[PDB]
């Protein structure tokens, strides 16, 4: 499923991400934009045998099990398939763990590269929230 920006903002707010670990809602929308272009089915294979899954491109070396990733942990205790859903609950619950893991939203390369130091509030401009 490909989300609308405001649709996704609404969903993330309902899931408790506004100001979660200090990150106002626009951070999360912006992260999703630049990780997955709001596509819940986004997957990207990486040179280390890992894969990034879902709207927040969560990595299979650390967070979920895809049964094929060398040297992997499954810290969110989920199958990676759960992160490819049209409902975002799994990805959000894992995002909440990742953002609390010691690096904030710097855990997402796309947040670091495209959201950090920008007017992220713009990403919820126009949204009925």
């Amino acid at each position: 499923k490909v989300f609308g920006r405001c649709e996704l903002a609404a969903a993330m707010k309902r899931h408790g991400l506004d100001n979660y670990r200090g990150y106002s809602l626009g951070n999360w929308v912006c992260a999703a934009k630049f990780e997955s272009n709001f596509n819940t089915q986004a997957t990207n294979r990486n040179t280390d045998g890992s894969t990034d899954y879902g709207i927040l491109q969560i990595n299979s070396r650390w967070w979920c099990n895809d049964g094929r990733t060398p040297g992997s942990r499954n810290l969110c205790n989920i199958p990676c398939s759960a992160l490819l859903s049209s409902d975002i609950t799994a990805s959000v619950n894992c995002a909440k763990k990742i953002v609390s893991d010691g690096n904030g939203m710097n855990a997402w390369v796309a947040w670091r590269n495209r959201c950090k130091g920008t007017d992220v509030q713009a990403w919820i401009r126009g949204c009925r929230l």
């Binding site: 990780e35 990486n46 280390d48 890992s50 990034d52 990595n59 650390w62 953002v99 010691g102 855990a107």
Partner: protein, 114 residues
């Protein structure tokens, strides 16, 4: 790169030792770390972790981690290496490669009791 010190340690039976590892990377974080020991005379290193005589300390803010071994005996002799774990949400190839790096090692000699 991971800087492990000291390179070599000689201790008497009964003493303690501490080995330090510092990750020299301004980008990647230190999430946790691991320790391995290669026995004298072999090629194969096996995990050592926190518990009992082994005391691990991780300092994420300094990107360092340490292993203390108390109540040393000759059986503690060998080569020890650290390995960092640097987690990330989405894939980062720099930090991915750091997770495959080891410290340069510490060669530990514990002398027998008399």
């Amino acid at each position: 790169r991971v800087d492990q010190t000291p390179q070599r340690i000689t201790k008497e039976t009964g003493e303690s030792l501490t080995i330090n590892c510092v990750v020299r990377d301004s980008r990647c974080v230190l999430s946790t770390g691991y320790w391995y020991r290669k026995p004298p005379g072999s090629r194969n290193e096996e995990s050592i972790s926190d518990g009992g005589r082994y005391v691990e300390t991780v300092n994420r803010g300094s990107k360092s981690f340490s292993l203390r071994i108390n109540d040393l005996t000759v059986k503690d002799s060998g080569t020890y290496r650290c390995k960092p774990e640097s987690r990330y949400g989405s894939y980062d190839a720099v930090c991915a490669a750091l997770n495959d790096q080891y410290g340069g090692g510490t060669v530990v000699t514990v002398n027998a009791a008399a």
